[model samples]
Target: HMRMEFRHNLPSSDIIFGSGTLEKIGEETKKWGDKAILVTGKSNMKKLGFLADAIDYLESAGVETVHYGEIEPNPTTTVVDEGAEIVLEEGCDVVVALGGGSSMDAAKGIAMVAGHSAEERDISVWDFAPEGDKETKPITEKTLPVIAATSTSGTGSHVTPYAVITNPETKGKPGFGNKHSFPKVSIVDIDILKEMPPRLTAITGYDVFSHVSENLTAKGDHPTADPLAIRAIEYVTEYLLRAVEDGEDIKAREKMAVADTYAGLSNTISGTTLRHAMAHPISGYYPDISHGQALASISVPIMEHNIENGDEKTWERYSRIAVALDASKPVDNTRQAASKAVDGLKNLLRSLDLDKPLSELGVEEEKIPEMTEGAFIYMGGGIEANPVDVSKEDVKEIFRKSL
Candidate 1:
């Protein structure tokens, strides 16, 4: 096996997981600050008057609120700046991220830049973070406390220290931020996820699958993380399809939610290798492609690349996941069964009506080179963490093969 050291850091707050935890928002908000900046995208939180309930709950707890709900599908740095402006202007003491990762990530960025100098807009990835002292800290000592009322099972932004935001002007793609990205409280309520349509469910579920799969297959000589990754992949194999088919199924929704959370924790610790590294550039270049869609399209192929990194132990783990996804027979060898892991995911993608290619999504052949170049730029993080090294040109070939 490829033995490597890995670091595991989890959030340091209460993760209240249950049905209808939204009702507990008032109690949770009281522990943070007296004022909150509610961040979200366009959703039933506003249309169905759920926002009123949250406001009432917070108000009942003596907390004031400023709502910033302009988060788009792919959140940008510009959105973060706007939110930071609101945080400063309203003197909001807390930030409650109430939508998907886009909103949560934007909230993280806002929290980080809330009291900083105006010229620090060029913050790229962490390795190349902007120069600053205590004042340059992502967020101040009075950094706005964050809570997540997640409406999506994907991204798992609530459970991890990673925030993904895009910077278009710099051709900057989605990348991790600092430890401050993790929420102080993650109030995951299945009711919110049940409202997601089939398409949304499929897309987000794909993200869950990719999280488990990529983390399990990551390159680091990770000793402690492998077992957690195995369990996470098993969870994804068992519950993703069920959640996609019946969004209202609380049992399945809860399992998938827990799975995403578990997988997110695993990915945060082990780091996502193949799919995440390659997909960031694709989404950066093509605005139409969602994170989960980008992940699903390349998942199987990435697994094929990961096949060479580990020993029979890794192969057995993958084979077990395959059997969980499709319990038919043991006629196949370990390699074949491992490859079936990809087949099972692709099959589920088809069943969920999410098996799409870049070209089918209107991406032309001409754009592949740019996409490849983007993936190559940050290839080090994901590449070095993988079971083996993948050169920039190798990444180009993989993207080409994926196309």
Candidate 2:
């Protein structure tokens, strides 16, 4: 067993978890600012009436509102800048992100930029890009308060310090984490999840597992992260399929919501690992590939690589995960138990009907080298935190093997 270092920083967010939590958005947003900028995707929230309802609630609470609903699945820095401009023009005092990670991340970026004086803020939101040489200002008192209303069970952006945004010019998707990015309040309501389609549920639920699995095996694992990570893994193992099969199942939806929150908290302590590192670049290069799909296609191959080449201590971690995931029968032998961990993941993927190979997903043999380069360039932090020190050549091999 690895010795516990007991050094870690935990996220600070007032999380309201349960059914009907969406009803509290008005009261919550009003507490932070009298004027709010509601950020979200182009249509889902409006079509579901969540946007109109949220606006009505805020207006009832005497909070003025404006909307920035142009956010896309992979939010761009340009979109974030536009939202910030709106916030500044409207003099909005608070930002309410009413969708998934993309909406929430864009809101966070807007708040960070709009809160600062134009001279002090980076219009590009590139200060935190992994491979960038751009200037950025530190977030502090000026950042507008954020209220996150999560409509999906993926990308714990609601409760974490991380905000991922894409830069079209660089073709990179980098996540920026700062003390200020954590939402002041997070509302996880199952009512909103009823609007989710089956495909969205499967992909996002898998994202929850990806967050948990990667954090548990991250090189930066802290004593504080273990329980949260393990519990999240167990939750996804039990409830992901249920949520996928029946989007209207409140029990499954609620459980998966809690699981996603747990996964988010787990990431604050340990961060992500190899698969997520690789997924970022794929999504960056191929904008149409969903984040969860990219992760699913590459995860098993990376797991196989880690098992074959990672240190023994890392194998022990994988074995424990197998036990947590019920991927294997009870066993004292770490190596034998560890092998079951990958099998469990594959089995889960099969059940989700997401057992897709890279080739099947449109990744051609010719693009492997460029994709590999992007992974190392934009996801160095994740790469460095992986259990195995993956080389560029190793990544190339994994990509080909995944095909």
Candidate 3:
């Protein structure tokens, strides 16, 4: 008899979820600290009035708030350092993220670096860059507490310890996090999600699918994360397209939110696989491209590569994914069932209007050399996280095929 044992790292942040959960921010945030640096992206939250309302709620809760706005879609190390500088200068003890992945990720980065700064270490956020050479600093217990209120239904940032910070100097965008980076509390409000437009809804919805699919197929052996990954995939299969078609479909939006949270939780436990590993470098190099868009361009190609090269369990997992997508039939051959996973994801990409080659998605063919190198440099962790080992040439071909 043989028994397989796996350790799961989880018990993520305390999540407050619902249509009106935004109203609970002040109450929950106050538990973390007396003051918070409200981190956010450029405009969406402000345009929607969530920013002002967030400050109001925080203030009402007797928590002083400082706004750190204009965080880019692909947030940089400078952004984190700048926000952390405010965190220290303003004496803000809590870091509050008030948008999608970027805001949440940047806030986490700020928290880590802010905590370090408080210890009198003059370090840039890049000093803590999870990847790269000897200078990298691991997240420590000193990391400031964080609270997040998500405005999008797609990113699992609220639940994940990961913070995908960009560094233009190194051309790296690594999703770095540790147990300490987990948000103290997360607010997932569908009322905020319902306001998301079609394009954003589409891209972020794609992110949810990628997160669960990658988590299910990645290297980590977090048994508890398995069901959540599978269920989230099913929900994305069933509801993502619905929400994308019409943001007004509250049920679809609600299901998408649930899927996002579930996938984020699974991803927090197991981490994302090759697809995410690949997407990071792309977004890092080409800052304008959203993470989901980069994933869409090459997801099918990567999945196909894994199907051809992965172990038996890989085939089994992908076959199950095809089943969840309603693309595999019981009568089909086992290997072909695995292929259906590739086909199913391809069809979803097409449906979501994300079926495009790298060239079409604003990626230059010539930059492949640099981006490919970037993958190995900072995203080596991603490559290692893949179910199958990939060489530089293997990555180059995937990039070409995606092109």
Candidate 4:
């Protein structure tokens, strides 16, 4: 904490947050362009009437719209390409992503590819992904404006520039983006998020904890990110369980929404660490087990490994996490204090019914090798950014232990 040897750059845009902010979608979309492609997941928005509300708003604002609601749980490059083709065909000028993180990512990818095609040469989303030793396309000034109207609180896609996209053919999911990918506007209406199912609420809320903790422990630290992450951690401790237990608790949901917004800003500053890298590939390999479930299963083991082996600064950071959750007592040993952070996380998971081992989530013992290797290949940045050193062997050990 003494040294000021780090640089922090906050990449963000206009954010409209609160309970009744959903009404501003059409008005906001109108500011960007006339023809908007309303991108979303298959059914949630439609069933909840948010999709209809969105269309009505755009039309009332005198903007043309095209519905492309084919995004999946884990957005794919092919789907991104297909959506971009629709944008080109319909001559859509703006992209309105209305759902969770997957929907936002798919929309951003579509906007980037379509804009790139309109100005530069046509390219696929994979060309913009970060994978292997090969060169990838850059997000430049030519990228399209994106409006992220979120229906979930945990993923923080509303304020982040990064997007996680899956490669169905290769079974790899890589997250890559830049300042150019930041959304032009984000609407975080707590009312819209109130529609998420209980299980999903628990999972996504837990993911919020994971994001804040990782940002605090990320390598190549950003000074501004620490306080933001710490505050978000406090919100998770105070409100996550409340939101999970009673979805109708508007106060709890609003607190979580605030935490998510802070998490997104800190995420832009420090990014995530090893835990996120470990969780990303599970969805790529086992499509049924979402990132949040995978994260909840393996988080404690990863924390244990880091706290046991990391430097004193790492221990201090973890101790802060425990204190933020109000989970620690006075302790002389630094490592012992850090262990409280793991306990706090475990308790949160237990309350949410997410304390079970990964094996129960349909992860096979034999596939550990592939998942482990995939982590290094596609998520090497996060692995390298861990506060403590991590190797392929360590990853395998953690996976097997979680299973």
Using Cα atoms with residue i matched to residue i, what is each candidate's TM-score against the true structure? 0.88, 0.95, 0.97, 0.97
Candidate 2 stretches greater than 4 Å from native:
1-3, 119-122, 132-137, 331-333
Q: Name the lDDT value of residue 33 in candidate 1.
A: 84
What is every candidate's alpha-carbon RMSD to the true fold?
A: 3.7, 1.9, 1.6, 1.6
Error of 2 at 200 (Å): 0.6
Candidates 2 and 3: which is better by lDDT? Answer: 3
Write one digit per residue (lDDT tens) for candidate 3, span 1-403. 4366777787557888888888999998899899989999888889988888899999999999989996989899888888888888889999999999999999999999999784444988887776656568878988999998998888898988888888998888877888899988989998899999988998999999998888888874667888998898888889988988888899999999999999889888887778887888899989999889999999988999998987777788888889888787652435667898988898888888999899997898888878888888777777888989999889988999999
lDDT of 2 by residue, 1-403 (tens): 6565656887576999877788899999999999999999999999999899899988998889998889999888889988888887878999999999889989988888788757434455765466733444566767779999999998888888878888888778877767677899999988997678988998888899898888877884476777888888888888888888888888888888888998888888788988998898788778788899999999899998887877667777788778777886574435666788898888888988888988887888898898888888778788888988999999999998889
Off by over 4 Å in 4: 118-121, 329-333
| Lowest lDDT 10-residue stretch of candidate 3 | 328-337
What are the clashing pairs of model 4?
none
Compute the lDDT of residue 225 as modeled in candidate 1: 53
TM-score of model 3 relative to the true fold?
0.97
Q: Per-residue lDDT tens digits of candidate 4, residues 275-315? A: 88889889999877887898999998999999999877788
lDDT of 1 by residue, 1-403 (tens): 5454556665564688887788887779778888888888876678756677777887887788888878887777677777777777777778888887777877777766663524433332232222212122343443457888888888878877666777676444645555565778888888787887778887887787777666766654554556666566566667767777777778888887887777667777777876788888777777678988888777666777766555565666567667656733352436666777777777777877777776676666677667766665643466666665677667777776676
lDDT at position 80, candidate 2: 90
Model 1 misses residue 133 by how many Å?
A: 19
Provide the global lDDT of candidate 1 against the true structure: 0.70
